[PDB]
Amino acid sequence: TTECDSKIIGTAVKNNLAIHSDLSYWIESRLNDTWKLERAVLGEVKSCTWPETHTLWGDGILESDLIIPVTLAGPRSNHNRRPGYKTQNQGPWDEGRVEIDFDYCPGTTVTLSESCGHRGPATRTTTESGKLITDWCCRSCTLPPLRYQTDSGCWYGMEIRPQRHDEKTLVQSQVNA
Amino acid sequence: TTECDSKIIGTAVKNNLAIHSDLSYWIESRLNDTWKLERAVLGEVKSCTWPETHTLWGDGILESDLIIPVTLAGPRSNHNRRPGYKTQNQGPWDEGRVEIDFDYCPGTTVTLSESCGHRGPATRTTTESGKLITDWCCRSCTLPPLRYQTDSGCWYGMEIRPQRHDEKTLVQSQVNA
Amino acid sequence: DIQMTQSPASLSASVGETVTITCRASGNIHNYLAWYQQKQGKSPQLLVYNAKTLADGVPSRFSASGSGTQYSLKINSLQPEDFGSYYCQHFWSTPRTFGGGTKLEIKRADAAPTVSIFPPSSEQLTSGGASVVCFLNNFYPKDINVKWKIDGSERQNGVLNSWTDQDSKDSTYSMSSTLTLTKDEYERHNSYTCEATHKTSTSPIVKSFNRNE
Amino acid sequence: DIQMTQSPASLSASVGETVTITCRASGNIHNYLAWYQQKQGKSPQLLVYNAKTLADGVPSRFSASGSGTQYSLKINSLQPEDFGSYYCQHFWSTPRTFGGGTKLEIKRADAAPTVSIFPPSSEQLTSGGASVVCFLNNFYPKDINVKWKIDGSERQNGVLNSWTDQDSKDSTYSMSSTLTLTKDEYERHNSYTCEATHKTSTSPIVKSFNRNE
Amino acid sequence: QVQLQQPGAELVKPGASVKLSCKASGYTFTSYWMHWVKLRPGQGFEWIGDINPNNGGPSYNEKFKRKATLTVDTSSSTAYMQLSSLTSEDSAVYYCTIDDGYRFGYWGQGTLVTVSAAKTTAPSVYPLAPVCGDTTGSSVTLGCLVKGYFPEPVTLTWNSGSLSSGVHTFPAVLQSDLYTLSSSVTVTSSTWPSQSITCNVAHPASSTKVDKKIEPR
Amino acid sequence: QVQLQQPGAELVKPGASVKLSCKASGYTFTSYWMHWVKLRPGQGFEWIGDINPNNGGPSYNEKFKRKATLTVDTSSSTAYMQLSSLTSEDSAVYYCTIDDGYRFGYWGQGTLVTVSAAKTTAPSVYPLAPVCGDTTGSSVTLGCLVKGYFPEPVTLTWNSGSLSSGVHTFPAVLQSDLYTLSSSVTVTSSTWPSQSITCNVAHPASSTKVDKKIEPR
């Protein structure tokens, strides 16, 4: 509802690399085959609006296509996008520091299947007991998978659900932005 | 109709300064009171489209409000704007190197008056004979005036016309982008 | 997009009084704003552009300011001329959008209406129709009640009313009431009366005539 | 915005033949494109998403590719099933827009129509109306001419025609012609005839009956 | 199983307003945005907008901003689209569908909205029996004529859907604010009139259900 | 002098198309973009789009993209807006105006477009004379009644415009596809009826020009 402080902000694109940053955020999209989000470092999740004046490539954008929620200071930018993933309103935003990228969580695998569960709250790869969940899946996402990294463990994007639908103690995000 | 080479391009905004640049273009807008175009250096006028991926602040833009024509590799950016001036389709683009800024041409003055002529082709401050034109005006522009600088002399924006409507040998732009 | 919400929707103020109307944009429009004045049935006139710059010929009593999303048009020493609707429009982004508008009333003296009554014309009677017309001219405030009485009994159906806009000079109002009957229904009765109940008095201002006279 | 222009607007091809339909966007949509199939009167089915990814249950004979502003849906070994309209839609920017569409004909064997004629029902005759119905079933190509003859003379007014879409199995067509008369006009004459002129033959396929029989 | 349920048809007088519904079933409702699409003959498809099941936040096609109003009830898993001040240009089929990954993988059956001043009229159903005497070949064609109804749609079956082969139902045609639809069915002569063949016509707008048995002449 | 000229009114049947014109005068035509604005009671102002007089390049409000088509003839300094498939929702006043510097400083008089199936009808003009006998005070009020016309507008003057003071022309009112308008004029009794007072009514739609002299009863 409010706008972020534009005194500590810096957005720059040069050659094949684009970066929307400030003191807490470092949002990097790269041109490889296509322009897409490569890595987002969120030192501490904000709750403001990223100013359009410091936004690259923000023409005709549907907010539901933006990986990082605009309400969480996500830039209204086509750089803030990734094929196969809608907006991550239910990511682990209440874990403090969070780092999004596109790679596999250690010991885990992600498979494409229409059988897989529909997108839900972001689930951590380790249970409350600390047991690792190895088999994951998705219906219509792309690989490598959307991965969160917080101080409490490694998470997957909303689209990605545990393949063994039968997990007992799941650690899932409780926030909805 | 075609898009510019995005290999030699760099766009960056930090603090109060925003720059859309490549090897030939250097387009600088600054925040003072408001965000507006401060200076554009065009080493050689291009005829392509500035890629949105490297465009800052390009949301909901009417092209006729953009100082540097999009057909001349002008960024579809609200940074590419200046109060009191519409698109400069008839600027001295056929003079090779051209530098836009906002200041007065030496020996000249610009006055606001409804009496002044409507906007036309960009007129140089010196005639074909080399005689200087001192008195200029505009209907609804803002000050300091839009100023071009080429190897052949100093020019004013389309909105700005010679106050003495009675000048004999005018050097005016013949291009219409 | 950019949506222009204008306030107040309507406003009434006396001559010489200072008025201020506000215009709010859903997004920052960076002083790319114009104020227009329009009074039906003419085309809108440019009052202000660039938020604070007056157009040519606009009196010194007009001013305008604001920045960001907040803007204001202020009229000092309000004149009877300055009646009509006022609109704000941004020139920042696309599409261009306008404010909802603000109708300006010139608040003035209370005025009793001048009532005139008119029997059907011989031409209309020849056509087989019969309209009785009642003119309520130069009154204030605008709200007024017109009651038609045929032979003493109120007639409600077939009545067509039409107000004028506020007068440019005396700031008053005028309304026309037309009771349309058939020729037979008109000849069925004798006494025709129009009564005007207004704020100025609880006593109805009455005009009447008789058919066979 | 982004406008999707699809080509060809219509296309006719035999079973087993390879077809390719193209979709062009006014701006680069970055492989955010989906192909749908719809045949009236059902809802559209997702064929492709992400330009090159087939949806679940889509046969191997379907493929799709392209990048930038140019995309293509290719059907290898065309089947009678694959008749119907094909649409392309982008998921890149807002608003979402669709292609104009491409109707796919299954080009097939030429087929003579099976003609049946039907006199008015006793119920309709009781109502005072009289419709004579002619069914032209299972023919190809789609274009066909129906001529109504009353007592040998052609009747043109009061005729209502209706084609079906191409059949999902034999790829043929069927059309219904209804000649609506009043009961009196129907009883005014005797012989009623429907003639079907089709590509397959210059000789009209004729069905007829007599009223008092 | 994932399914979207919406009324088959709605009749609304010009200048009035109507509210279309879309009841979702078989998936976590908040997970997928709810999009509305307009389909009109000649105009093709038109994306109207979407609603966010999480916060109830709408995003409109700028063209439909004053026409449509998107709302949502997450509790009942139902989306709503209110069309106001309707004209003849708003007469179309309105689909609701979900974006399950930059793709409309699940659609509704679509709601046929008719904008007309014409009055609802029950259909007259007439049995179409072959001409007197014999019938060509070993196959006989029967017919069913639905006449003088409004508005769309009607549903016509043969023997309650038991008879589906050899059936041709023809699209209705409008004339003087009244629709006319017809259907044919071709069976073997050994089955008719030996076994009964009845056409079943339903016109929900007038709450009409008529069964007409095809009797020989 | 800068002026924009456009027809006062246009009547067009629903579903049809009409092309509005805008002839510019008094300035270098190519210097200023040509914008079109829609004004409808209740909906307020709506920017439809603009056309570039230099290259003929249009920019549309996304809402009016399928409704309006903007074209331009630079040679004749005239802009055109084609409205197609018109409904009752398209019945409004259409202005053309120029942006002479992030401001609409010059407007046209606006074209009143009426979309209706109703037929053009010439008005009946009736003189309204005071009741028999005397008249209250030293001032007399006369009237003029224009009845049963379609469509808008009509123009009513008194004594060919020579009598403008004390004149009240009332906005027309529609009933059963026919308009009714009235006007009053208050003059001194020393001038009426001593000097003739005639109301002049013009209805261009039906090519009607009627002068009605107010005679004493």
Interface contacts B/C by beta carbons within 8 Å: 23
Nearest CA in chain A to B30: A53
Q: Beta partners for B30?
A: B17, B36
From CA F104, how far away is CA C98, in angstroms rounded? Answer: 12
Under a CB-based contact definition with an 8 Å cutoff, are residues B161 and B133 in contact? no
**Nearest-neighbour CA in chain F from E69: distance (Å):** 15
Domain with CATH 2.60.40.10 in chain D: 1-108, 109-211
**Nearest-neighbour CA in chain E from D73: distance (Å):** 16
Q: Cα D98–D99–D101 angle (5° rounding)?
A: 125
From CA A93, how far away is CA A47, in angstroms rounded? Answer: 10
Task: Tell whether F154 and F196 lie within a shared domain.
Answer: yes
Under a CB-based contact definition with an 8 Å cutoff, are residues B27 and B40 in contact? yes
The domain boundary, picked from E80, E96, E117, lies at E117
From CA D20, how far away is CA D13, in angstroms rounded? Answer: 11
For residue C174 the two structure tokens come to: 């005028």
Query: Chains near C, with 3+ CB pairs < 8 A?
Result: B, F
Residues 6+ apart with CB under 8 A from F133: none
Contact call for F143 and C118, based on CB within 8 A:
yes
Residue A97 DSSP code: S
From CA D177, how far away is CA D132, in angstroms rounded? Answer: 8
Task: Tell whether E199 and E179 lie within a shared domain.
Answer: yes
What is the extent of the structural domain holding F144?
A: 118-216
From CA F106, how far away is CA F4, in angstroms rounded? Answer: 8
Contact call for E102 and A84, based on CB within 8 A:
yes
The CA-atom distances, in angstroms, between F18 and each of A35, A160, F67 are: 45, 54, 11
Contact call for B118 and F50, based on CB within 8 A:
no
CB burial of A157-166 (b: ≥16 within 10 Å; e: otherwise) equals bbbbbbbeee
User: Of C195, C201, C154, C144, whose CA–CA distance to C174 is shortest?
Assistant: C144
From CA F203, how far away is CA F207, in angstroms rounded? Answer: 6
For residue E148 the two structure tokens come to: 């003088």
User: Of B124, B135, B136, B119, whose CA–CA distance to B85 is shortest?
Assistant: B119
User: Of E85, E88, E118, whose CA–CA distance to E18 is shortest?
Assistant: E85
Under a CB-based contact definition with an 8 Å cutoff, are residues A53 and A116 in contact? no
Under a CB-based contact definition with an 8 Å cutoff, are residues A169 and A63 in contact? no
Judging contact as 3 or more Cβ pairs under 8 Å, the answer for A and E is yes
From CA F146, how far away is CA F181, in angstroms rounded? Answer: 5
Under a CB-based contact definition with an 8 Å cutoff, are residues B91 and B42 in contact? no
Q: Count how many Cα atoms sit within 13 Å of the Cα of residue D26 in the half-sphere of its side chain.
A: 10
Under a CB-based contact definition with an 8 Å cutoff, are residues A63 and A76 in contact? yes
- Tell me, what amino acid is at C111? A
The CA-atom distances, in angstroms, between D203 and each of D24, D118, D207 are: 45, 22, 13
Q: How many domains does chain F have?
A: 2
Q: How many domains does chain A have?
A: 1
User: Of F23, F32, F20, whose CA–CA distance to F3 is shortest?
Assistant: F23
User: Of F89, F147, F149, whose CA–CA distance to F113 is shortest?
Assistant: F89
- Tell me, what amino acid is at E161? G
Nearest to E168 among D87, D124, D137 (CB): D137
User: Of E147, E154, E144, whose CA–CA distance to E207 is shortest?
Assistant: E154
Under a CB-based contact definition with an 8 Å cutoff, are residues E32 and E22 in contact? no
Q: Based on C-alpha coordinates, what's the Rg of chain E?
A: 21
Relative to beta strand F139-149, strand F178-188 is antiparallel
Q: Beta partners for E3?
A: E25
Residues 6+ apart with CB under 8 A from A61: A76, A77, A78, B59, D93, D94
What is the extent of the structural domain holding A55?
A: 1-177
- Tell me, what amino acid is at E175? Q
The domain boundary, picked from E117, E151, E185, lies at E117
For residue F207 the two structure tokens come to: 């090519």
Residues 6+ apart with CB under 8 A from E191: none
Q: Is E100 on the interface with A (CB under 8 A)?
A: yes
Reduced to 3 states (helix: H, G, I; strand: E, B; else coil), residue B43 is coil
Reduced to 3 states (helix: H, G, I; strand: E, B; else coil), residue B72 is helix
Task: Tell whether E111 and E122 lie within a shared domain.
Answer: no
Q: Is A160 on the interface with E (CB under 8 A)?
A: no
Q: Count how many Cα atoms sit within 13 Å of the Cα of residue A46 in the half-sphere of its side chain.
A: 22
Contact call for A118 and E52, based on CB within 8 A:
no
Cβ-count burial of F205 within 10 angstroms (0-12 exposed, 13-18 middle, 19+ buried)?
A: buried
Task: Tell whether F43 and F112 lie within a shared domain.
Answer: yes
Query: Chains near F, with 3+ CB pairs < 8 A?
Result: B, C, E
Q: What is the 3-state secondary structure (H, E, C) of chain C?
A: CCCEEEECCEEEEECCCCEEEEEEECCCCCCCEEEEEECCCCCCEEEEECCCEECCCCCCCEEEEEECCEEEEEECCCCHHHCEEEEEEECCCCCCCECCCEEEEEECCCECCEEEEECCCHHHHHHCEEEEEEEEEEEECCCEEEEEEECCEEECCCEEEEECCCCCCCCCEEEEEEEEEEHHHHHCCCEEEEEEEECCEEEEEEEEEECCC
Nearest to D30 among A34, A60, A62 (CB): A34
User: Of F174, F180, F170, F188, whose CA–CA distance to C174 is shortest?
Assistant: F170
User: Of A124, A88, A92, whose CA–CA distance to A108 is shortest?
Assistant: A124
Q: What is the 3-state secondary structure (H, E, C) of chain D?
A: CCCEEEECCEEEEECCCCEEEEEEECCCCCCCEEEEEECCCCCCEEEEECCCEECCCCCCCEEEEEECCEEEEEECCCCHHHCEEEEEEECCCCCCCECCCEEEEEECCCECCEEEEECCCHHHHHHCEEEEEEEEEEEECCCEEEEEEECCEEECCCEEEEECCCCCCCCCEEEEEEEEEEHHHHHCCCEEEEEEEECCEEEEEEEEEECCC
Nearest to E103 among A65, A140, A176 (CB): A140
Contact call for E66 and F43, based on CB within 8 A:
yes
Residues of C in contact with F171 (CB under 8 A): 162-164
From CA A41, how far away is CA A98, in angstroms rounded? Answer: 7
CATH tag, D1-108: 2.60.40.10
Under a CB-based contact definition with an 8 Å cutoff, are residues F130 and F160 in contact? no
For residue A29 the two structure tokens come to: 């999209």
Contact call for B176 and F54, based on CB within 8 A:
yes
Nearest CA in chain D to E179: D160
Task: Tell whether E112 and E135 lie within a shared domain.
Answer: no
User: Of F204, F212, F208, whose CA–CA distance to F153 is shortest?
Assistant: F204
Task: Tell whether F104 and F138 lie within a shared domain.
Answer: no
User: Of A121, A132, A176, whose CA–CA distance to A154 is shortest?
Assistant: A132
> Tokens 């387009």 correspond to what residue?
B27
Under a CB-based contact definition with an 8 Å cutoff, are residues C48 and C55 in contact? yes
The CA-atom distances, in angstroms, between C145 and each of C105, C142, C205 are: 20, 10, 10
Judging contact as 3 or more Cβ pairs under 8 Å, the answer for E and F is yes
User: Of B141, B177, B153, B172, whose CA–CA distance to B68 is shortest?
Assistant: B177
From CA A57, how far away is CA B53, in angstroms rounded? Answer: 5
Task: Tell whether E104 and E38 lie within a shared domain.
Answer: yes
Cβ-count burial of D15 within 10 angstroms (0-12 exposed, 13-18 middle, 19+ buried)?
A: middle
Architecture label for domain C109-211 = Sandwich (2.60)
Contact call for F124 and C127, based on CB within 8 A:
yes
Q: Indicate the resolution in Å.
A: 3.0
Relative to beta strand D191-198, strand D144-150 is antiparallel
The total of other beta-carbon atoms located within 10 Å of residue C41's CB is 12
Q: Count how many Cα atoms sit within 13 Å of the Cα of residue F155 in the half-sphere of its side chain.
A: 12
The total of other beta-carbon atoms located within 10 Å of residue E183's CB is 21
Under a CB-based contact definition with an 8 Å cutoff, are residues A40 and A68 in contact? yes
Classify the C-alpha dihedral A158-A160-A162-A165 as positive or negative.
positive
From CA F16, how far away is CA E5, in angstroms rounded? Answer: 36
User: Of E140, E88, E125, E95, whose CA–CA distance to E206 is shortest?
Assistant: E125
Q: How far apart are the first and last CA of chain B?
A: 12
**Nearest-neighbour CA in chain A from B4: distance (Å):** 13
Residues 6+ apart with CB under 8 A from C184: none
Relative to beta strand C84-90, strand C33-38 is antiparallel
User: Of B155, B157, B81, B158, whose CA–CA distance to B119 is shortest?
Assistant: B158
From CA C164, how far away is CA C173, in angstroms rounded? Answer: 6
Residue E24 has φ and ψ, to the nearest 5°, of -90, 145
Under a CB-based contact definition with an 8 Å cutoff, are residues B158 and B88 in contact? yes
Relative to beta strand F92-99, strand F78-83 is unpaired
Residues 6+ apart with CB under 8 A from A21: A9, A10, A11, A27
Nearest to E44 among D49, D98, D160 (CB): D98
Q: What is the dihedral of CA C72, C75, C76, C82, to 10 degrees?
A: -170
Q: What is the CATH number of the domain that holds E155?
A: 2.60.40.10
From CA E47, how far away is CA E97, in angstroms rounded? Answer: 10
Cβ-count burial of C159 within 10 angstroms (0-12 exposed, 13-18 middle, 19+ buried)?
A: middle
> Tokens 């930090």 correspond to what residue?
B14
Contact call for E88 and F14, based on CB within 8 A:
yes
From CA A20, how far away is CA A77, in angstroms rounded? Answer: 9
The CA-atom distances, in angstroms, between D117 and each of D112, D192, D193, F160 are: 16, 9, 8, 72
Relative to beta strand F44-51, strand C62-67 is unpaired
From CA E202, how far away is CA E174, in angstroms rounded? Answer: 18
Classify the C-alpha dihedral C96-C101-C106-C111 as positive or negative.
positive
Residues 6+ apart with CB under 8 A from C88: C4, C6, C23, C33, C34, C35, C36, C71, C73, C98, C99
The total of other beta-carbon atoms located within 10 Å of residue F137's CB is 9
Contact call for B118 and F102, based on CB within 8 A:
no
Contact call for A61 and D32, based on CB within 8 A:
no
